[PDB]
């Protein structure tokens, strides 16, 4: 029998167990027949590309279905009185009573009601029309295509990374801290300043006119001359109505704290200064480890230097242990991600960031 | 005196707008023009190939406007920065193709500052700044064919020679060693330029006939060639890192495995022929000579 090709012990099993265990040990690349470390790392790289593309496709599908069969343009007119819509229902097994029961939220057909709280997120980040949602879905389709092609490409013989490339901790940390974290956060702050805040203050800004609409009346002059306080003057008053120009300020970076009086959520300018500050800090942090210019720390010497008379050898030879073991890295990443997810939940139910999301109790 | 100088620089009442980006555009552009003329006139022969076969593209060394060109830097340079002061002597700089690097770098900075001046003037006059967006595509293409490709190939000699014959030779060798035609992005650039010419013809004819959404149509027609040039610049930049075009040769096999061959195989044969400019072996060379 052919399947499974990666284990001859299972392939010679006459029973149906071969069908079961073949699935179970499919993605355990370490124990496959004739597996080398370099092939292991390259296959893992491609698989991670695939998972990223799957995530992008899932987000694109959410956006597309919301834009197509949802009531986004109706929901923004009354976020506290209209149920958001997830996707339409097409069940031939339905009856008349179910059709009458599920025709809700003002729709003209059976339809679901969204509880992922994405309508509030899309409203807060700036998008307000169905065409914007459609454009986002198409762009995410293109991104998924690009990542799938990248996964294919870095698998070809002319592009397969070497084993020494994978085991380069310092360069990976530098790039993934300064670039992956800091630059993305800075770009998000720029998106909030250039688009999200003006949109929340009534001024419509998009790809067509963001090149001629300055986010602040004083453009780059106070920032470059050190007079940063200019960007904190005239904040949004307590009477501001979200999405309108009533009570809207002009400050793009504030430290108001607390919540918006109307949306019961954090001020957008606070989010802007927050993500900008953490972007700066992450960019600074990403210049720590030595890669190619002599300057910078090296992880091995730091680990081997922090010994102790009570713990014996301290943190000696831990660099090799962590670098040469993928399971150690996976466990560390999983623990950190779990702690961060718990933090996200705990600090997100109590400090809502999206407009009118604290009043939608089901989604919270 | 400084305030009056600044007012004159920023003034829109001047005969020609200079702008603060112009304060860098003018020196770089003038340096590029002067050095390009000097090289095109009296450049000493340059050993681009790195072998004892020097190549001279100046007019004073027996060339016309069609054949004359500015030879890229010597293959012994590679990607190393080669300014005049880093050369042991001016003759060493001249024989290593340094004028090519000088012209290319100053001209690239000049076109970047031309972008800057365009945007500055569009912002001063209050006009929407989409002319720079369109101007990006030719600039991106120029950077890809003059800077990105040499960096990817690991030598400045692989850039486009500054001339007419050199341009055709570079295009031929690019096709030979990269198969750019089969690459989908040169296809997209070709589609973009052909569509742009088509739209130009249609709208010019329509206006001439009418001369004794419209805005959406005009903008989309204008954006089509810009997108095409962006795609072709992306394709050239990807090629620079050896991401060659489609290789459909050796694909179709018969019942017993014998290769049948398609037109892709014919294109591969043509590329190999442009790669080596003679015949292959088993062609009965003379056995003995006197």
């Amino acid at each position: 029998t052919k399947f499974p090709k990666f284990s001859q012990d299972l392939a010679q099993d006459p029973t149906t167990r071969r069908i079961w265990y073949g699935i179970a040990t499919a993605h355990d690349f370490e124990t496959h027949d004739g597996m080398t470390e370099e092939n292991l790392y390259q296959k893992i790289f491609a698989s991670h590309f695939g998972h990223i593309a799957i995530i992008f496709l899932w987000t694109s599908g959410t956006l597309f279905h919301v834009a197509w069969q949802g009531n986004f343009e109706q929901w923004i007119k009354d976020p506290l009185n209209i149920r958001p819509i997830a996707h339409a229902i097409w069940d031939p097994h339905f009856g008349e009573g179910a059709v009458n029961a599920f025709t809700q939220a003002g729709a003209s057909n059976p339809v679901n009601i969204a509880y992922s709280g994405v309508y509030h997120w899309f409203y807060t980040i700036g998008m307000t029309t169905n065409q914007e949602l459609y454009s986002g879905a198409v762009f995410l389709l293109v991104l998924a295509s690009l990542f799938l092609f990248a996964g294919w490409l870095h698998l070809q013989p002319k592009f397969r990374p070497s084993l020494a490339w994978f085991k380069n901790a310092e360069s990976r940390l530098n790039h993934h801290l300064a670039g992956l974290f800091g630059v993305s956060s800075l770009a998000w702050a720029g998106h909030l300043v250039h688009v999200a805040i003006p949109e929340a203050r009534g001024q419509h800004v998009g790809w067509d006119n963001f090149l001629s609409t300055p986010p602040h009346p004083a453009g780059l002059m106070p920032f470059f001359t050190g007079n940063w306080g200019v960007y904190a003057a005239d904040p949004d008053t307590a009477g501001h109505i979200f999405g309108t120009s009533e009570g809207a300020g002009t400050a793009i970076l504030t430290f108001l704290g607390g919540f918006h009086p109307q949306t019961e959520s954090l001020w957008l300018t606070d989010i802007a200064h927050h993500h900008l500050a953490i972007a700066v800090i992450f960019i600074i942090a990403g210049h720590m480890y030595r890669t190619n210019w002599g300057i910078g720390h090296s992880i091995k010497e730091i680990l081997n230097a922090h010994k102790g008379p009570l713990t014996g050898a301290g943190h000696t030879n831990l660099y090799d242990t962590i670098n040469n073991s993928l399971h150690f890295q996976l466990g560390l990443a999983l623990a950190s991600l779990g702690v961060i997810t718990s933090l996200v939940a705990q600090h997100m139910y109590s400090l809502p960031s999206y407009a009118f999301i604290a009043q939608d109790h089901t989604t919270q | 005196l400084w305030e009056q100088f600044c007012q004159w620089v920023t003034s829109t009442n001047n005969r020609i707008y200079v702008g603060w980006f112009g304060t860098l555009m003018i020196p770089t552009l003038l340096t590029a023009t002067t050095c390009f003329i000097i090289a095109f006139i009296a450049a000493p022969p340059v050993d681009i190939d790195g072998i004892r076969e020097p190549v001279a593209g100046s007019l004073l060394y027996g060339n016309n406007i069609i054949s004359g060109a500015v030879v890229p830097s010597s293959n012994a340079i590679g990607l190393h920065f080669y300014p005049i002061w880093e050369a042991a002597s001016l003759d060493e700089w001249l024989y290593n193709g340094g004028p090519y690097q000088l012209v290319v770098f100053h001209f690239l900075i000049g076109i970047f500052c031309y972008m800057g001046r365009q945007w500055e003037l569009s912002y001063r006059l209050g006009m929407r700044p989409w002319i720079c967006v369109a101007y990006s595509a030719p600039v991106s293409a120029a950077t890809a064919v003059f800077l990105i490709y040499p960096i990817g190939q690991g030598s400045f000699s692989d850039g486009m020679p500054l001339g007419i014959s050199g341009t055709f030779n570079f295009m031929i060798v690019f096709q030979a060693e990269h198969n750019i035609l089969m690459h989908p992005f040169h296809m997209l650039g070709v589609a973009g330029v052909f569509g742009g010419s088509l739209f130009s013809a249609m709208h010019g004819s329509l206006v001439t006939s009418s001369l004794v959404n419209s805005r959406s149509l005009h903008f989309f027609l204008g954006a089509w060639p810009v997108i095409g040039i962006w795609f072709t610049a992306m394709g050239v930049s990807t090629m620079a890192f050896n991401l060659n075009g489609f290789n459909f040769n050796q694909s179709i096999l018969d019942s017993q495995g014998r290769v049948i061959g398609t037109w892709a195989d014919v294109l591969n044969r043509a590329n190999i022929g442009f790669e080596v400019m003679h015949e292959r072996n088993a062609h009965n060379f003379p056995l003995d000579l006197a």
Binding site: M221, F224 | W20, F21, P83, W85, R124
Partner: peptide
Amino acid sequence: LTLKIAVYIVVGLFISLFIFGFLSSDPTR
């Protein structure tokens, strides 16, 4: 080596003028 210093000061003063002029212009910034 005088040529290197000459071009160095030339570009230094050119970019100094370029960065100072934008600060000088109060309109549209």
